[PDB]
Design a binder for these strands. Structure first.
Ligand SMILES: Nc1ncnc2c1ncn2[C@@H]1O[C@H](COP(=O)(O)OP(=O)(O)O)[C@@H](O)[C@H]1O
Ligand SMILES: Nc1ncnc2c1ncn2[C@@H]1O[C@H](COP(=O)(O)OP(=O)(O)O)[C@@H](O)[C@H]1O
Ligand SMILES: Nc1ncnc2c1ncn2[C@@H]1O[C@H](COP(=O)(O)OP(=O)(O)O)[C@@H](O)[C@H]1O
Ligand SMILES: Nc1ncnc2c1ncn2[C@@H]1O[C@H](COP(=O)(O)OP(=O)(O)O)[C@@H](O)[C@H]1O
Lengths: 257, 257, 120, 257
DNA sequence: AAAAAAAAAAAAAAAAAAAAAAAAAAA
DNA sequence: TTTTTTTTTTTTTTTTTTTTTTTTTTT
């Protein structure tokens, strides 16, 4: 069944180029060449993790000689209430280096060693709100001991937590802020996203004022909502024998959430 | 590329002789001759750590005999929540010795042994606030047992840390303060920074009011912010093919950082 | 005094180039390029230790780049009845790395990692 | 340099199919289907290690199912004086499962769990002659509690340890010899060797009376001994400029080793 | 009414001894 | 062989701080 193949294909995830993504990539590349630490602030379901992650694929570490890998960008997602030891362990795990059983001071020394051996000019920390207040001192300690840029990606809680300590705030003053979709930006994004993700036999008439209206009402500018809504509508539309997404199907999916 | 060589020179660190650095150096020489302990208190981005390093560099340990080399000055920066054993390890790692597996009492003894063997006319400890209270007791123990002076570099909170212990208040009464740059001092230094650090082929006249307002407003009298801004502005200007920093280039960095 | 200077010089150390040393050095370069193990056999007070020590200085480590140093030749002198743990300690300390505490297996893993990092 | 490229090729490692290797592979497949433990005894420098490794390469991990890797064959190389903890830990790490730090009882249970989750039809221990006698009992316990066939790859030292326990000798009765080459087998192997490893613009005529006599005197039926000889003679000849191995060069190489 | 001072409950991090068993060694 | 002798290897009791939550008080 061809429909089965399309269902399986849609149930996946794909990357669709966007302007804000390119802006973030260029800004972060500038910071990486300057070795200047910074932070990034945005709302949930805006796709900032996808931008931080898509950037790292381009700069994947490649080593041809017998010497160990030289990695320029390392990327870790801390768990809830991640402490100092837990964070160091993740840095070591990402570099495919054997964790040494021992104490926290041993973890600190080992982390400095593995980071000194490789490049690791830029470190992208996601979900920085979850980071425990005790650990930020270690983060900036690393940023000062070695010339490595540190990027703290978080929401408004990141702002709130950072502004409580003077040194951390001084270290991470420069920043980039994400926005939401609206107007022509939103319409162009919907058109581009459907052309990039949907290969349905017939057009969905997305440009129509009414479809844009209901998608705006259900989306509110959050790409993390538009992607899910349109993918579910597509799977359901194809499942009922409709090659294209239809107005009633859109209304149904929007009503469920 | 020649521009890349100039940029690499701008990225590298250097030290400019300044009024505050010389003041601290003369004070420290007096204290070590008196063998008296004291404190150094200042704000962030004031360059007091750099001044300590510049002091250490002048007193090079020269051995003119077969007997072990003698170190007159020791410098340590403890890690977060440094305990007694960690500090003793730092002392014995700074000096060219090793410590075998053993107890805290053994570490105390080995540290005292190498401290007696070495000269250690003065001991400088950065970031005093991080030290644990028991570690403070041990620092005082060393200062009282051996003819060695102890300098506790600290921020505004150093007084608060030492207010919970009457004994350190009794022995560390003398103190020196670091301040900020304002008025004529800031302007004089700025001219010196343009001529002594930057590789700018053509002078940009930073002391002029048009370019003074920007530097002064963003910097707020902190040395670190100023040097950061100037190095970055020079790098950006040379990358653009300029032999002199333009007004727009100087203004962009301030807002970005 | 002239005499004291000459006497102090005489009581020091010096090296006389010999055909034995050059022979050893050519042979060792061959073995190093071929990555083959071998033996050096000789009586005491013949200075074979000095010849090997001199071989070491010809190929010095390069740390011009920011990366860890890549010393191609390591030279150690085990003490009497040296156990395996202590041999690993010698290797790790020579290359200027911290020796993690633990069992002989931990030292073994640490030493292999360091030996892969450097040229050796 | 083209010559250096050919030399780099000659300094590499290749694999050549021999009847000895195919015999071992068929025998091992039989034992794995039968789920019966056994052992292989063969002299040093025979290449049995390489034959077992090639066998492992024949059956790659089967991730075709959605949840676990389902690797049917594992292969571990114990270190000298391998204890039970190190053995269990190597087995665990080979299956990409984290080590649950604890006591040897925890390692035992964890290893059993990961061996049950994966297929693990057969387990191969390379150079088992340095496996501690305490741990052979653990190996037998694994072979009994789980439907796993265990193959021991060791030489003459295996049996002098196995015969120290009545229980272990019953498990590994099926034995296969793995010895040297001689006569027509040796001559055929040499010609195959001269064709596969010495892609050479000029035949060295190794399949001849005197060349075979030299190689036999130096080789004594050991392929491992022969490897260095032939590869190194080819490299030396090509470095000097000779397109093939002259008899004098071969004799010189043999004298060196 | 609505901010400011007060008893349980979880959770994380670190040496310092002691015993036993095995393996190698020396006359 | 008898004993020594060490050498690992593996298996075991005390000390301290930090949140959160909640209930009474006062103002
Ligand atoms: N550039 C993009 N291309 C395609 N889908 C995207 C993109 N950015 C976000 N998405 C969708 O949004 C989700 C990712 O958003 P998320 O990483 O949760 O945002 P954040 O982590 O910044 O809160 C994914 O499920 C994906 O489908
Ligand atoms: N005398 C100096 N010469 C050059 N640069 C200086 C000097 N003093 C401070 N700086 C700048 O300030 C930074 C050092 O500040 P820092 O080490 O944080 O001192 P502190 O710990 O006292 O704040 C350096 O990056 C350096 O560029
Ligand atoms: N090539 C040499 N030139 C000068 N003196 C030498 C040379 N080789 C050895 N010696 C002398 O011999 C001593 C070193 O010999 P040593 O290294 O003990 O030999 P081995 O260790 O092989 O017994 C030194 O004290 C040195 O004076
Ligand atoms: N079938 C083969 N193909 C290629 N090389 C082989 C083969 N058999 C043996 N060799 C050579 O012999 C060596 C393998 O010997 P090894 O695995 O050490 O035997 P063991 O460890 O059983 O003594 C390798 O260096 C390899 O070059």
């Amino acid at each position: 069944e061809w429909l089965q193949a399309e269902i399986a294909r849609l149930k996946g995830k794909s990357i669709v180029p966007l302007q804000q993504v390119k802006t973030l990539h260029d800004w972060l590349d500038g910071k990486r060449k300057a070795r200047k630490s910074c932070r990034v602030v945005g709302e949930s379901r805006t796709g900032k993790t996808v931008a931080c992650d898509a950037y790292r694929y381009r700069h994947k570490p490649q080593q041809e000689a017998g010497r160990p890998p030289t990695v320029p960008v390392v990327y870790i997602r801390p768990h809830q209430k991640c402490g100092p030891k837990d964070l160091f362990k993740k840095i070591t795990e990402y570099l495919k280096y054997r964790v040494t059983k021992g104490t926290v001071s041993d973890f600190r020394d080992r982390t400095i060693e593995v980071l000194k051996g490789c490049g690791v000019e830029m470190l992208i920390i996601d979900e920085a709100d979850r980071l425990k207040p005790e650990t930020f001192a270690d983060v900036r300690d690393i940023a000062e001991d070695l010339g490595i840029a540190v990027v703290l990606v978080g929401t408004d809680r990141l702002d709130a937590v950072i502004k409580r300590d003077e040194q951390v705030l001084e270290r991470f003053r420069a920043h980039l802020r994400f926005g939401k979709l609206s107007g022509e930006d939103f319409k162009n994004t919907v058109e581009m996203w459907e052309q990039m993700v949907l290969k349905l036999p017939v057009s969905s008439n997305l440009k129509s004022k009414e479809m844009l209206r209901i998608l705006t009402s259900a989306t509110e500018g959050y790409i993390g909502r538009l992607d899910e809504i349109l993918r579910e509508a597509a799977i359901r539309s194809l499942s009922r024998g409709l090659k294209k997404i239809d107005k009633a199907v859109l209304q149904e999916v929007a009503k469920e959430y």
